[PDB]
Amino acid sequence: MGFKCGIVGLPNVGKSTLFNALTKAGPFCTIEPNTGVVPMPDPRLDALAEIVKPERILPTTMEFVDIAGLVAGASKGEGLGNKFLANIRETDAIGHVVRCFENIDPLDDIDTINTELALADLDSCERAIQRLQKRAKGGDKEAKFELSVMEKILPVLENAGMIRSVGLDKEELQAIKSYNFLTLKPTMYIANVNEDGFENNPYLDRVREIAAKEGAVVVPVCAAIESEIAELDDEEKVEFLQDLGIEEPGLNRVIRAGYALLNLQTYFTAGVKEVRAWTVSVGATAPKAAAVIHTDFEKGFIRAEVIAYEDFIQFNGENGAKEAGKWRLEGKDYIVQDGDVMHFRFNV
């Protein structure tokens, strides 16, 4: 959708251990514009590879961005050259690291940052109201429509609330898109714990408590335990894992949780030459999905040949599934499903 999640956090909370784990680890694809770009870790790839035996395997990517600058008075601070807020502006969602062990209600911590986001949005909202008012006083119908949206979010921002928590409809969103409001960015909590934190943890519970209220995802990592795995060899690490019920780097969970947060889904193409993960927004039709591969699919699309991920696996590839009849022709309004194995036609 834009493809950036910004990692934010209070000064002593592991943001750093976590974003370095993420940077270390960034088949035959060379991605090298990577101030936080990583390959999506997706075990569907290898599972597909096992059936298909492709020469190459091409995951997709997730971009994370480590938000520079100081938090404590970001809103006032910006006039002084603080970039916390502008940095957040260049992203599409927010992964919000919360210290979830001792050395204080987690809410106070989370509030420290949300205050500064709401305060900046308030200032935007107030300044907009002044301009849009004078347009509307002059009969300007669009400006009356935006203003009325401003006037719904204003008192929410006055009270440190999030624009994302206001039930605005699509027309309403559409009209305020251009403000690039910070408190409208989707967010998930990255609850950072001790290598022994997952368990009976009053902190982590209170964060889950807080998230439940606003529909938010919470993803526990131990950035301690996570930063370890990260300065071992390619493979000189396997034996490190098993030692508990984490079957993979708990980091892979944060990568996938942020890919979701940006509303992204994967579909796959699979053949003897390659298995590739392809990114589209949730709810894309096949033609939108397809246009990701080539731009003439927009107009040129004829059909999608589609197998549900679960069938491709079960029936061992495309001739299996065909045999079992799980190989569908789908059309212009088919809504791509997570992990569909697709082949697109622009000829018979």
UniProtKB/Swiss-Prot annotation:
Domain of life: Bacteria
TGS domain location: 263-346
Reported cofactor(s): Mg(2+)
Keywords for the protein's UniProt record, in alphabetical order: ATP-binding, Magnesium, Metal-binding, Nucleotide-binding
Annotated binding of ATP, by residue: N12, V13, G14, K15, S16, T17
GO MF annotation, one: ribosomal large subunit binding
Coiled-coil spans in chain: none
CDD domains named in the record: TGS_YchF_OLA1 (cd04867), YchF (cd01900)
Positions bound to Mg(2+): S16, T30
PROSITE patterns referenced in this protein's UniProt entry, alphabetically: G_OBG (PS51710), TGS (PS51880)
GO CC terms of this entry: cytoplasm
Domain OBG-type G: 3-241
Domain notes: Composed of 3 distinct structural domains: the N-terminal domain, which has a mononucleotide binding fold typical for the P-loop NTPases, followed by a pronounced alpha-helical coiled coil domain and the C-terminal domain, which may be involved in RNA binding.
Family of the protein in this entry: Belongs to the TRAFAC class OBG-HflX-like GTPase superfamily. OBG GTPase family. YchF/OLA1 subfamily.
Record's function text: ATPase that binds to both the 70S ribosome and the 50S ribosomal subunit in a nucleotide-independent manner. Does not hydrolyze GTP.
The name this protein goes by in its record: Ribosome-binding ATPase YchF
Protein species of origin: Haemophilus influenzae (strain ATCC 51907 / DSM 11121 / KW20 / Rd)
Underlying gene: ychF
